[PDB]
Design an enzyme around this catalytic site. Structure first.
Site, PDB file in Angstrom:
ATOM      1  N   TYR A 115       0.846  -1.215   0.000  1.00 48.47           N
ATOM      2  CA  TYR A 115       0.000   0.000   0.000  1.00 48.47           C
ATOM      3  C   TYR A 115       0.864   1.241   0.000  1.00 48.47           C
ATOM      4  O   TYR A 115       1.845   1.360   0.760  1.00 48.47           O
ATOM      5  CB  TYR A 115      -0.920  -0.001   1.230  1.00 48.47           C
ATOM      6  CG  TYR A 115      -2.052  -0.953   1.092  1.00 48.47           C
ATOM      7  CD1 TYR A 115      -1.862  -2.353   1.119  1.00 48.47           C
ATOM      8  CD2 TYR A 115      -3.335  -0.444   1.003  1.00 48.47           C
ATOM      9  CE1 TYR A 115      -2.929  -3.227   1.050  1.00 48.47           C
ATOM     10  CE2 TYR A 115      -4.398  -1.279   0.899  1.00 48.47           C
ATOM     11  CZ  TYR A 115      -4.214  -2.670   0.943  1.00 48.47           C
ATOM     12  OH  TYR A 115      -5.353  -3.472   0.842  1.00 48.47           O
TER      13      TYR A 115
HETATM   14  N1  LIG Z   1      -6.176  -9.872 -13.113  1.00 41.86           N
HETATM   15  C1  LIG Z   1      -6.816  -8.671 -13.009  1.00 41.86           C
HETATM   16  N2  LIG Z   1      -6.896  -7.778 -14.031  1.00 41.86           N
HETATM   17  C2  LIG Z   1      -7.518  -6.580 -13.867  1.00 41.86           C
HETATM   18  N3  LIG Z   1      -8.135  -6.193 -12.729  1.00 41.86           N
HETATM   19  C3  LIG Z   1      -8.140  -6.994 -11.634  1.00 41.86           C
HETATM   20  C4  LIG Z   1      -7.453  -8.304 -11.726  1.00 41.86           C
HETATM   21  N4  LIG Z   1      -7.582  -8.926 -10.538  1.00 41.86           N
HETATM   22  C5  LIG Z   1      -8.278  -8.081  -9.753  1.00 41.86           C
HETATM   23  N5  LIG Z   1      -8.603  -6.928 -10.380  1.00 41.86           N
HETATM   24  C6  LIG Z   1      -9.391  -5.839  -9.739  1.00 41.86           C
HETATM   25  O1  LIG Z   1      -8.690  -5.141  -8.689  1.00 41.86           O
HETATM   26  C7  LIG Z   1      -9.392  -5.250  -7.436  1.00 41.86           C
HETATM   27  C8  LIG Z   1      -8.416  -5.422  -6.274  1.00 41.86           C
HETATM   28  O2  LIG Z   1      -9.085  -5.218  -5.022  1.00 41.86           O
HETATM   29  P1  LIG Z   1      -9.059  -6.247  -3.778  1.00 41.86           P
HETATM   30  O3  LIG Z   1      -8.328  -7.500  -4.203  1.00 41.86           O
HETATM   31  O4  LIG Z   1     -10.485  -6.348  -3.428  1.00 41.86           O
HETATM   32  C9  LIG Z   1      -8.146  -5.550  -2.393  1.00 41.86           C
HETATM   33  P2  LIG Z   1      -8.259  -6.633  -0.925  1.00 41.86           P
HETATM   34  O5  LIG Z   1      -6.924  -7.276  -0.775  1.00 41.86           O
HETATM   35  O6  LIG Z   1      -9.429  -7.524  -1.164  1.00 41.86           O
HETATM   36  O7  LIG Z   1      -8.540  -5.773   0.413  1.00 41.86           O
HETATM   37  P3  LIG Z   1      -9.952  -5.024   0.789  1.00 41.86           P
HETATM   38  O8  LIG Z   1     -10.381  -5.650   2.089  1.00 41.86           O
HETATM   39  O9  LIG Z   1      -9.549  -3.555   0.884  1.00 41.86           O
HETATM   40  O10 LIG Z   1     -10.924  -5.226  -0.352  1.00 41.86           O
HETATM   41  C10 LIG Z   1     -10.210  -6.520  -7.581  1.00 41.86           C
HETATM   42  O11 LIG Z   1     -11.389  -6.534  -6.772  1.00 41.86           O
HETATM   43  C11 LIG Z   1     -10.535  -6.568  -9.052  1.00 41.86           C
HETATM   44  O12 LIG Z   1     -11.756  -5.881  -9.327  1.00 41.86           O
END
Ligand SMILES: Nc1ncnc2c1ncn2[C@@H]1O[C@H](COP(=O)(O)CP(=O)(O)OP(=O)(O)O)[C@@H](O)[C@H]1O
Ligand SMILES: Nc1ncnc2c1ncn2[C@@H]1O[C@H](COP(=O)(O)CP(=O)(O)OP(=O)(O)O)[C@@H](O)[C@H]1O
Ligand SMILES: [Mn+2]
Ligand SMILES: [Mn+2]
Lengths: 176, 176
Positions: free
Chosen positions: B42
């Site tokens: 982060y």
């Molecule tokens: N391979 C990929 N290509 C493009 N976008 C992607 C991807 N994988 C994930 N993303 C997008 O980027 C977002 C990343 O957010 P999260 O993984 O939800 C953070 P987290 O680790 O879950 O903590 P949180 O509790 O703050 O949500 C995903 O929800 C998805 O929508």
């Protein structure tokens, strides 16, 4: 060919493309990309926060090579890093969320040649005419000294002379 | 699969992993990534400029899939955009030039599955436990309520009950 946090560079106005091209031919220069139209969108915060720090940030599209780059230049004029990007509009929207928005655009025709460790970049800009840059990439600030002068040795062997040197960036030349 | 500037997402504590996995098979989920280690760095400005706008910015590496992502969440609820990147360290240095530096890191194991338009993630975090996120990305702000309700229905189907819902983010749960 583009590895390092520093791009040591010397830029010159080109008085004859013919002799420049003959030297490229002489020295067995390798063509990397030829006659690409490069469109550079420069982004900054609403109070020119990056320019006030000697930083430029650019989204670059090069056609027809298809290369798309996100570039952060500065502070200073050796520091330069870039990342290939898949989708210019996605990156532009992400940067807008952080507060960076298009400030101006610079367009040019560019060809890039290699001679050993040296890059020779040949540019044409509508108002301004022809330019060539001799450059060497490095990741080590502790070796910046040798390289410049060496761009100077190479430039000396290349027919690019001090009287034609241009220290200004394109944004400086264009009043941006 | 990951198209949009909005992401509707519900996170649940998982009390029964067996039920969740059995429903993944029954519903013919397809695995996008399985048991990847995910390391999220982060980034924020010294004064927490992004947090103050309810923006989070993450550089994520996932192994062994080799996926690397630059993710900007916010400002505020349901806004999220991401870009694939080739080199975390390279984008990290670029963002450092702009003033954003590592604030903290979160690590987890994550599997990502698709069932039609839905994304279901199954996460394990060492100090905390097992979670699952159900998510749908869209560019259309007019359907966000419907989509969130669809996610909750979909989740109940995996044995994830309204009362296991977890509105806090991992950063909040880990004291960041
Ligand atoms: N391979 C990929 N290509 C493009 N976008 C992607 C991807 N994988 C994930 N993303 C997008 O980027 C977002 C990343 O957010 P999260 O993984 O939800 C953070 P987290 O680790 O879950 O903590 P949180 O509790 O703050 O949500 C995903 O929800 C998805 O929508
Ligand atoms: N195809 C490629 N892949 C990866 N990096 C590249 C690349 N092409 C160029 N780069 C990098 O991105 C940097 C871009 O800087 P420059 O192209 O020199 C800006 P410029 O348009 O010459 O303007 P200036 O004179 O106004 O500063 C290069 O120094 C190089 O390191
Ligand atoms: Mn240049
Ligand atoms: Mn999440």
């Amino acid at each position: 060919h583009f590895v390092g946090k520093y791009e040591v560079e010397l830029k010159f106005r080109v008085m004859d493309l013919t002799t420049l091209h003959e030297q490229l031919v002489a020295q067995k220069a390798t063509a990397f990309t030829l006659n690409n139209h490069e469109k550079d969108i420069y982004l900054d915060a609403n109070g020119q926060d990056l320019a006030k720090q000697q930083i430029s940030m650019v989204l670059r599209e090069m056609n027809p090579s298809g290369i798309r780059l996100w570039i952060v230049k500065g502070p200073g004029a050796e520091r330069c890093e870039a990342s290939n990007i898949e989708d210019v509009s996605k990156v532009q929207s992400m940067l807008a969320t952080l507060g960076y928005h298009p400030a101006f655009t610079i367009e040019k025709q560019r060809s890039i040649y290699f001679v050993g460790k040296f890059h020779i970049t040949v540019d044409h800009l509508t108002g301004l005419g022809d330019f060539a840059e001799i450059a060497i990439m490095t990741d080590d600030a502790t070796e910046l000294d040798k390289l410049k002068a060496e761009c100077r040795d190479f430039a000396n062997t290349f027919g690019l002379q001090v009287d034609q040197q241009e220290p200004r960036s394109y944004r400086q030349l264009l009043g941006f």
